[PDB]
């Protein structure tokens, strides 16, 4: 069969709800507390998804945990761009069925700039006509797109895994084949799209870092687990110790 693609569809996670009160009027603290809670929920599903990926257990347990944490934001942002595309044709941001951002929420959350970047990313899926299959292969490649500049524990297995995910995405790209203008260009397009996830995850990292720092002073609650990731791993990205692997320059 298409063994690889089968697996990706088989493990793809279901809907995750935020638990947000959509009849209260919007405040910053409520929206951000609902996002922090959704963040943890989606993290739980990301761990399960990731541990089921082809080859993922070739990695050292410590490389496993580290790439999950480093790549969490890019992953959630990408999945969310797809959900917005498929569920609402990119007019709003579909964080969750019970947490859809319109422009008013984009603004009340004080993440407008990041939200607008995310909506753009969402439009791109339309613009490029990304297939559900390309989406799934790209999302899988994003868990292997961000590493400590000082390398991983068993870096060689990582390098091999990533190469193999690059291959599978090349194998699956949408084109009329007797023309590599499409196929060579399709790949270019898709790798540009993947690259653009990184600055957005960086802006979001920056905003969440800052929010954790001042959280007591703005009544935002972080789940204990999110607090640890923000304070322990997040700052390695913001400080340049951990960095994306970019296709282009």
């Amino acid at each position: 069969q298409p063994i690889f693609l089968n697996v990706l569809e088989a493990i793809e996670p279901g809907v995750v709800c935020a638990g947000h009160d959509n009849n209260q009027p919007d405040s910053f603290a409520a929206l951000l507390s609902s996002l922090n809670e959704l963040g943890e929920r989606q993290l739980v599903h990301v761990v399960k998804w990731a541990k089921a990926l082809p080859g993922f257990r070739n990695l050292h347990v410590d490389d496993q945990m580290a790439v999950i944490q480093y790549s969490l934001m890019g992953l959630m942002v990408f999945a969310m761009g797809w959900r917005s595309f498929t569920n609402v044709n990119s007019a709003m941001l579909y964080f969750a069925p019970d947490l859809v951002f319109n422009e008013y929420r984009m603004h009340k959350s004080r993440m407008y700039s990041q939200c607008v970047r995310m909506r753009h990313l969402s439009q791109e899926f339309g613009w490029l006509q990304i297939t559900p299959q390309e989406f799934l292969c790209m999302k899988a490649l994003l868990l292997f797109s961000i590493i400590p500049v000082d390398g991983l524990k068993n870096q060689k297995f990582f390098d091999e895994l990533r190469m193999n995910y690059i291959k599978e995405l090349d194998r699956i790209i949408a084109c009329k084949r007797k023309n590599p203008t499409s196929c060579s260009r399709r790949f270019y397009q898709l790798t540009k799209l993947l690259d653009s996830v990184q600055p957005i995850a960086r802006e979001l990292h920056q905003f969440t870092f800052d929010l954790l720092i001042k959280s007591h002073m703005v009544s935002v609650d972080f789940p204990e687990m999110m607090a640890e990731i923000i304070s322990v791993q997040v700052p390695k990205i913001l400080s340049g110790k951990v960095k994306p692997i970019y296709f282009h320059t």
Binding site: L43, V44, V47, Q64, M65, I68, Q69, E224, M225, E228, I229, V232
Partner: peptide, 9 residues
């Protein structure tokens, strides 16, 4: 810490 124990279950 908190993430490793999640990773565990």
């Amino acid at each position: 810490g908190a993430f490793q124990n999640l990773f565990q279950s």
